[PDB]
Symmetry: D3
Subunit: 153 residues, 6 copies
């Protein structure tokens, strides 16, 4: 089968780190069958995070948002796969954890919106933008999976 | 508008114990991020069980509910958190396990309405009712969660 | 009592999800009455996919389920047929909801790791097709009363 | 039948390990007969640790054991005391072996998340010190015939 | 390549441990080449436990092994026989260390949920006794290069 | 509590990645209670892998080793904690996954020495060394665990 493998940026937030969910979140996607090509614990500089949420820079929560997202280290992840962006969004769950369906990362492991543990790109366009914003040039590591023949047709 | 801290009475029904599921159910709620302020293996006295199911006292099966809930030990739990009530019902799943969705407790662990493992208050008003009903005035334990600031803003 | 047929496909084995899938049905509360690693011969696979014989993918499908061993299973319980389907998830893993088998453990339709009868009729058919006279095992669950009224 | 006293300490609750610890003993096969989240008043704690009153760490200990609610437990089964001591692991989480509770989930003796009666006589003493009578519950385990002969 | 016979005793099935026990061997890295739920006949139960024939617990043993269906398994991998022994843990569940199957999920010797050949030749001998000719399925793991050099 | 906190270098070898065990491994230490201060997927250059295994350079397996450790990305890690070095090694198991006791990382998830899915510093000094060899000045993230007070005195 031929079908482009998109990339999506997935980020475990400060709270996710504090609660020790870094291993758990990663394990969810590893079991799903997606490839990890970019990974790193990272203390996000204020500028980068402000660039990341550039679109929300006018909002009244923006200050508080940047404050939190930089208040502690986060984990930067880049996942490759076919239809992985939307898939990631599904596995993550609704923005509001209380409304997230059990089985999803937020519905299983979080309770409040302002602390929803993780971020998934909302589109392949943003997946590219974010992976290029949070990751330096040669940080990504591409590799052929040994299970490639058993993950995809 | 911001919602107040809430309390709910979650109960592991007789079958939950027989199948050694007390631990996993407590875990699902500990993992979600709520705070356990009430817990005890309890032998529900007939009078207490009667008050618990008072809204069904007119039902022809009312006897079964009382009889059954008194047939063996149960685990009483009192959980706290903003929106914990509506959330607990969500992690628990539809009454008929066969219909509860994969990911919910009943959805992943049960097969018949009658032996649907756990119970959670159906409303914030009923949560306070059941907690005060099942727990003796000194059985509730209040404490400050060290992860409070990472669970909610 | 209702019985359904559930099978882990070659990719489920390769990826080592046999124990996982089984555990999920055990925990749910259904009784396992049939189990066996089996290398499916072409003709039997074709028989299994009888109705898709005119389809375009048919051959690929036949290769896929014979490209490695499978693990046949016979599960019993009231309404197990539909429940099993719900636990397996949508045919397309990307579409199946998190919490289901394909929703958590697969990424593509052509390799969606598991199978479940879609009807009580096919349940008997498929079980009667993959299991031989006597390979099934009956037993009384000690937790029977704590699983059903 | 033999019963032992197991208690999840304050750090255990603070770290959301109650469910996990209970599950281990459940999955092991012993029967739970007593359970409760309890706020240990200083005197009960000092009586439990009666023998250490003279030691310099006494103050710290009492503060710690009462710094938050604990979860009291009572389990039943032949050899449950020693086994529970084995499942829990050496006093020092760093020396505790991988597979044991403290070994898998803790990092320091002063925060070694759980307790377990070190002998059957102590099991009775502690269950009697931490529980009130009506608190223990007796019941018949459906799976007994499959747990023992 | 060395093979060993692993089997889930009847107490394992009644307690829903089939999937969990297989997973321990899938996660370890070993290859499943034999599997089937089987109702063990008294005669076959006797040949297997020939060495314990003159033991006083023998009779109870034979009735136990025949008390319900069991799950027969064959795993491949160099050193598997010895590795399975460890994963299984000491005969008396109460003495098997945490981390092992008997140490985490059993409480008495007469209901130790699992079996494993104690040597390579007993593995060969046991697979020939529990599995018929083609019930074994030969296949190669796509992860071969990452499990052994 | 005046106890000295050391750091240890823990790395997920190429096979760990191939086998989707990155998460599981991370969760073992996360749940143990140690702190993650360094983490990154990385494709190791022969030169770096040799200066890392210089003490085995004369061995007959060295050549293969070097190629194995560089045959694909690995996941570098820096863990902090009192006695984390010795603990981490205990948590990993014997060099031979067939000997490693069940419950340890290698005894639970591997079947052969040359593919023992993970590495951990064998001493506090090699701890400092390896972290310095694999992590650049500034890749390590310092932070305060909200549970620090419940993990230690
Ligand atoms: N009912 C009963 N069974 C016993 C007693 N001692 C031993 N057995 C059973 C369970 C033991 O695993 C078996 C003797 O087993 P072996 O030491 O020959 O081998 P093994 O360690 O592989 O365990 P297995 O065949 O899996 O049950 O017979 C006893 O006192 N009472
Ligand atoms: N490919 C290959 N690698 C080997 C062989 N023997 C040892 N090694 C490698 C992997 C071992 O982890 C490493 C030696 O490690 P060690 O100093 O005994 O301690 P450890 O940090 O591995 O626990 O050398 C071997 O026989 N073949």
């Amino acid at each position: 089968s031929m079908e482009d493998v998109e990339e999506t940026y997935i980020m475990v937030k400060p709270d996710g780190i504090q609660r020790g969910l870094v291993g758990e979140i990663i394990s969810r996607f590893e079991k799903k069958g997606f490839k990890l090509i970019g990974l790193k614990m990272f203390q996000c500089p204020k500028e980068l995070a402000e660039e990341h949420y550039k679109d929300l820079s006018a909002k009244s929560f923006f200050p508080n948002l940047i404050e939190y997202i930089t208040s502690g280290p986060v984990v930067c992840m880049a996942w490759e796969g076919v239809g992985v962006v939307a898939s990631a969004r599904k596995l993550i769950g609704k923005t509001d954890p209380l409304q997230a369906e059990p089985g999803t990362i937020r519905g299983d492991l979080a309770v409040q919106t302002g602390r929803n543990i993780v971020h998934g790109s909302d589109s392949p366009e943003n997946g590219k933008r974010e992976i290029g914003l949070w990751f330096k040039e040669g940080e990504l590591c591409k590799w052929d999976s040994a299970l490639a023949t058993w993950l995809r047709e």
